[PDB]
Design a protein around this ligand. Structure first.
Ligand SMILES: [Mn+2]
Ligand SMILES: [Mn+2]
Ligand SMILES: [Mn+2]
Lengths: 482, 485
């Protein structure tokens, strides 16, 4: 009993486990998927039978850490045969995360944590970085509350790009899935585009509901075939696990019915505008459970929330590779685009990095950080916000002055390439090295700089210009998987 | 509770929400749409979960005002990125407003999967109503009307085209860009025409037409008639009399149901006045109107012998007429709506009153002592915004009442109506006081600002000559109104 010997379950998780086996038995489930988010947010793991799950509930399941050392295309940034080699770690199931996948045949699903065989936590496990952030927020008196609002694209699959000629090779991107848009229209919020796409959208809507996910709204975003699904507030690690499931389920559900959902920021398809992942955040007293961001008369935020906003602004440059992991996501670093090109904050202004949604006495007063990207890793994005903010609280960082025109603000600019965001983390190594782990940032810096290098040798430096056209390297790196 | 705090709900609005939630539960709905009419009459909004709509019945639901500052093809008319000091004097920014659900508008949409629908009113977070909300501008007319003792009784005669879809123009090179017109949906007529009212045309199109009829009927919309119009594939669908806000709400839902149902079975319904398709003539939205006494429920237009209308109805007609050029951009908001002059037809392009003459803007239907004595405005285009069309008639007609404006002798030197949306805006600019007073002064300057840009876009596309109303429908007009209106 690996799990019991190393004290990896709480009584809650233990009784959870007892019940997940009871649900498996009455539901007649034949497979149970066991997954974890890699460095990119992509769900990797194994599909177990129900005899093996019951054994994994004592021993765990062995997996190699090779995904962590590969890129999206499988090039070896780190040597796997010798930050090196391919040790084999234990997948430790978290029974509290179980869900009965409704688009699959008799298949359950539940997330896994990564552990060395000694029992200590694997230091690259992105979920572990969110646990670390949530634990430190619980030691300062706060619970992290997140409203998930996801902008993504919806397309019908023309060709799945399966011919041997299209398969690529480790380091050689495969062809993008061939798609076509489902609706046109730069008319935003049009009910007619909703009813047009609801043939497929009603299947995604029904799937989110069956997962007992707290779906809030389904909206026609601005661009042709661009969509917005928002969710009610969730708390802490739970919200990250839920973003994860939300993006996986949308993609899997669409594909079963012959559609392609992508969270790639800006697909290389004419008429497609950049997608954003704005992150609605507030803090709540771990005891009192009341928004500690609520302002008074004259305030747009409580002093606490003001401090949170300061560290969100202060650290957002080092944090950019986390809020915007992808190359392609930096075409959002632009003026006059409803996206943030500089560290500005404002009450009700979409051209800002931090947007305040608040009112005097309003228990829903909160911050909207808009430097986020839809394809971000939900554990690195949200822990970014937890680490960034709690720094502002701790160091009483004034956010400065609410900006009436963020695109004229003389505030510090945000990075405009993924190279720049990596540079900014190198020269502000601390805080993220104290919180994410020194080993992680060394790893993170080395791996992501390798992918920048591949974009550069494929497209050149002048293609990196954010206003530029979306390159084919972006399409054949992010469209299929993200 | 946002809605109790600013008392945005009467008790009836509260006796409804309780049963709105009750049949949501009874029927097992999973989505409720919350929609609102933008400057164009086009239904914007969100689709909310049950759990989430239960919240909006207390706190509302937020939404940006971008549609109001965007064109049909989403050019940015007003700077969206600079927050405003007095928004109503600079018109800049993307403020978040609250959508206040109105339960008296609840419907289960027949053609959709387990999905409900209601209308929302746009309010500032301050609790005070947003100054451009067209449904608010209708709410205002109905008030000033009830504050003079009258209810608005409205009869709708709505013409439109029903066509089969050949291509939805979804290829990426068709999608357009912000400010760029997307390609028009490719279509095919469904019947031949130039054989007006032909029963066999009706039976010919009833495969989908019955699906529209049935959908309108399930919505409890008071459908009066379906008729076969003159031009190929042109229909007219008329409705029984409706009152005040309900008639404009229904007008909106009428067009919404008609387009959504047709598209769901692969047809394209369009309220474009005159599509750029061979043989298609101009479609109209005629509005019969009368005033009733708000306490006796009785038609105040009914004429005695000697006069064609009562002196109340006669005054209204004068207010309909003396502001008709000003109001033109609210009864005929599209460039396309002015193409109405053709070699085989008569357009109501005269600002005049008549019983038989088809060129007069208003037709009178009145026999002595007849309880259905009324007037009929005919400059209405079908792709018109219902709130602003109806409120333009109440506002025009109340002027004539309060000022005893004389319409003059029935015309079978006739003053003419604006021939273009440019001229229509010229007319409103130079005679703005009554609309600035009753529609809001910020709305009128926002309206003239928005549409004058829509005209320069059209002019920049096809040139001054093709802008002439007599001329053929250009490609700018097709790619501006065909798909959305
Ligand atoms: Mn959005
Ligand atoms: Mn007719
Ligand atoms: Mn008529």
């Amino acid at each position: 009993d690996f799990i019991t010997k190393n004290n990896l379950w709480t009584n809650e998780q233990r009784d959870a486990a007892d019940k997940v086996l009871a649900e498996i038995d009455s539901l007649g489930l034949e497979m149970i998927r066991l997954s974890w988010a890699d460095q990119y947010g992509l769900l990797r793991g194994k599909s177990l039978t129900v005899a093996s799950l019951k054994s994994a509930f004592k021993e765990g399941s062995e997996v190699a850490i090779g995904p962590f050392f590969f890129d999206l295309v499988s090039s070896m940034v780190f040597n796997l045969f010798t930050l090196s080699g391919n040790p084999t770690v234990v997948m430790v199931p978290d029974p509290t995360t179980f869900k009965v996948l409704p688009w699959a045949d008799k298949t359950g699903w539940m997330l896994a944590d990564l552990h060395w065989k000694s029992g200590e936590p694997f230091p690259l496990c992105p979920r572990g970085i969110m646990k670390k952030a949530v634990k430190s927020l619980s030691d300062e008196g706060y619970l992290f509350k997140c409203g998930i609002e996801l902008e993504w694209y919806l397309t019908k699959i023309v060709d799945r790009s399966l011919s041997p000629e299209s398969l690529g090779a480790p380091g050689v991107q495969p062809d993008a899935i061939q798609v076509q848009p489902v609706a046109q229209g730069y008319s935003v919020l049009l009910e007619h585009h909703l009813d047009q796409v609801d043939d497929i959208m009603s299947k995604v809507r029904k799937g989110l509901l069956e997962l007992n996910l707290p779906l809030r709204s389904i909206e026609d975003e601005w661009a042709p075939s661009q969509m917005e699904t928002t969710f009610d507030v969730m708390e802490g690690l739970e919200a990250a696990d839920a973003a994860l499931l939300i993006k996986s389920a949308i993609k899997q559900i669409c594909s079963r019915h012959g559609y392609h959902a992508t969270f790639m920021c800006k697909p290389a398809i004419n008429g497609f505008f950049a997608s954003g992942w704005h992150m609605h955040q507030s803090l709540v007293d771990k005891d009192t459970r009341k928004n500690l961001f609520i302002p008074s008369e004259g305030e747009v935020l409580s002093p606490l929330g003001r401090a949170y906003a300061g560290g969100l602004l202060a650290n957002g440059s080092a944090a950019s590779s986390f809020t915007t992991p992808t190359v392609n996501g930096y075409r959002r670093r632009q003026p006059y685009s409803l996206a943030p090109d500089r560290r500005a904050w404002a009450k009700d202004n979409k051209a800002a990095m931090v947007r305040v949604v608040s009112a005097t006495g309003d228990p829903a007063s909160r911050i909207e950080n808009r430097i986020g990207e839809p394809g971000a890793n939900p554990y690195l994005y949200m822990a970014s916000q937890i680490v960034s903010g709690l720094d502002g609280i701790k160091n009483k960082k004034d956010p400065g002055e609410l900006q009436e025109s963020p695109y004229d603000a003389q505030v510090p600019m945000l990075p405009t390439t993924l190279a720049e965001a990596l540079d900014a983390l190198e020269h502000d190594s601390e805080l993220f090295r104290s919180c994410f782990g020194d080993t992680f940032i060394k790893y993170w810096l080395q791996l992501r700089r390798s992918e920048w290098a591949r974009f550069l040798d494929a497209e050149g430096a002048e293609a990196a210009e954010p206003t530029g056209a979306v390159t084919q390297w972006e399409q054949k790196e992010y469209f299929n998987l993200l």
